[PDB]
Structures are given as structure tokens and as C-alpha cells.
Amino acid sequence: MIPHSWICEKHILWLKDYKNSSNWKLFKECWKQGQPAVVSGVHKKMNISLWKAESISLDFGDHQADLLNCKDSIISNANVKEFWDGFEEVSKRQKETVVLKLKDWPSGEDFKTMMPARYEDLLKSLPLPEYCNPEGKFNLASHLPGFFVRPDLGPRLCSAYGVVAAKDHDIGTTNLHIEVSDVVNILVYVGIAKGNGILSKAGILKKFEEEDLDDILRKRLKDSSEIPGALWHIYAGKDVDKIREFLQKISKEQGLEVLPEHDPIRDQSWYVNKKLRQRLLEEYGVRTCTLIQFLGDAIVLPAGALHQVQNFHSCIQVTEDFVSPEHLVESFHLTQELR
Ligand SMILES: [Cl-]
Ligand SMILES: [Mn+2]
């Protein structure tokens, strides 16, 4: 047997054993319906020390990059060194402190070449390797001619503060967006921030518990060996048009001026907060799947799926693109629309 459960009223397959070599056989049956999957325990496969903030900060801290304020998506005056200093030290953050993100750094070929050991560890550790590994039999990514695949097909590193210190749970560390290709998202480090009156690890666990959760998720949360990092909301790709209309309607309501051809999904300008998700369900019938991503959880999303993320703790995520047959058509079309 293949240990598994379902989360979110059958939308998401939870594969419970990263070591089970037949995971793909069950995944295949759920993927073909456009269901996401999450594989827990991948950090146990990884060289987890390579992915700690202290290690990534030391190895790559001298390179300059833009830091984003997640509240308004305005590039910050902070440098990479100031970003990493504030990763777990709230007092070293600039002011109410800001939620910073170091996005896609490094990414694509630079990831493979500048972090070769981490890239090697990633390849070794990718779950569902039949799909997710470049040499997997169902992965078309390295076989397709160039124009079928996005130009930025690569691994990505994403590091960001949690929103808890700012006490602003209207902030997304990743705004609502659509996935142009199949993708696996792995939480490889969770950092507990300290200072300036921030909620503690335990106060933050209670914050997670106050969310509307599936019973299966509440159980994981009681488990002291699991470290919850980030709150995810995931939407079925079939709901993309309704969500876009909902956001355009909210935009008009708040008097938020827009261009005529205004596409809030493409803009990636929204974090759909609790009150808004409730209105989205009531007014358009669109259901939210809620996931808490724990350290070592790999979330696997098909092309066309939408999601947003809200780090509670400081988090480092590594994502990897792949191209399954199942969603190639959708992926190609979304890829072309990206022009
Ligand atoms: Cl490396
Ligand atoms: Mn994404």
C-alpha cells in the first residue's frame, strides 16, 4: 500500500511517506484530474544543513539583489545583508516592522551553477521523481523543443519573513497568481523570529490553530515533531475566470481605479484575505483549499492552478518546474499568453 490521506474535501492528495517508491502510481491517478499533491518528509532525504538560513546567508550573502516589501511590492532600501540579519532578529528589521522577501534568488541557471551542491541535493531529493526529476519518464521538460517551455524554466530559491511581527495578516508573502507550468514547492527551512514583542513559537502555533482547517491538518498541528511554516490557499484552475471577476469587482468597490483591460491575476497584486475568501465562496461558489506547509512538505501544483502564500515564520522555499503530459496543453497556452 501507499500511505496517503486526502485534504480539502478531496482536492489534494497527501502522500505520507517520501520513502515509498510507488508514490507516483497513486499520484498519477489524481494528477490526471488536476488535483495537487503534497509529499511530507522530503527534508529527511535532503542534506538539511545546506538549506539553513545561516548557511545560505554565508554562501551567497555578498551578492546584491532587490528586496521586496510584501505589503506594497515596493522595492526596499535594505540590502541582502540587512535582509538576512532580520530573518530571525526582528529588531534588525526596518520599521511596525516590514515583511521582506528575497524572491527567485538565485533562480534558473544561476541556481544550478552558483549553488551546485544545493542543486545536486535538490535533484536527489525531489519527490515523485518519475514526474519531478529531469530524468523522470513522465517529465517532458528536457525533451520538448524550446518554444513549448517557458524561458525561465528552472529551480528558484525564495526566502521571506513571516507576517506575524507586522501583525498584518492581510499581507501575502506570495500574492495570488497562476502557475504557468507544473511546479513542486519544498519548504526547506523554517526560522523562528525573535524580539520586539513578536508572538512566540507557541503563540504562532495557536495562530495556525485559529485558522479554518481540515481535521486531518489539525491533527498534524498537535504533533510537536512537525514545524508549521506557511499558510497556503490553493484554487482549482477551473475557477480562474470567477476569481478574476471577483477581484475586479472588489477593485471597483474600493474605488480602486483600473485600466479597462485590467487583469488582477496576471498583475499578482492581490492577497485574498479571510473576509475576501469568504465573499469569494458566497458570491461565486469558489472554494478555497487551505493548507499548512510544514518543514519538508513538497507541494506539487499543476499548470493552471492558482495559489497564494502567507509565511507565519521566516521561510525558505525551493521550487522546481517540470512538464507532465497531463497539463502540457494548458501549460503551453498559459506560457504563450506570457508574452
Ligand atoms: Cl551550493
Ligand atoms: Mn507559485
Curated annotation (Swiss-Prot):
Domain of life per record: Eukaryota
Record localization: Nucleus
Domain JmjC: 115-339
Residues that coordinate or bind Fe cation: 177, 179, 307
Disulfide bonding pattern of the chain: none
UniProt similarity note: Belongs to the JHDM2 histone demethylase family.
Function: Probable histone demethylase that specifically demethylates 'Lys-9' of histone H3, thereby playing a central role in histone code. Demethylation of Lys residue generates formaldehyde and succinate. May be involved in hormone-dependent transcriptional activation, by participating in recruitment to androgen-receptor target genes.
Domain topic, free-text comment: Leu-Xaa-Xaa-Leu-Leu (LXXLL) motifs are known to mediate the association with nuclear receptors.
Subunit: Interacts specifically with the ligand-binding domain of the thyroid receptor (TR). Requires the presence of thyroid hormone for its interaction.
Name of the protein in its database record: Probable JmjC domain-containing histone demethylation protein 2C
Taxonomic lineage: Eukaryota, Metazoa, Chordata, Craniata, Vertebrata
Gene behind this protein: JMJD1C
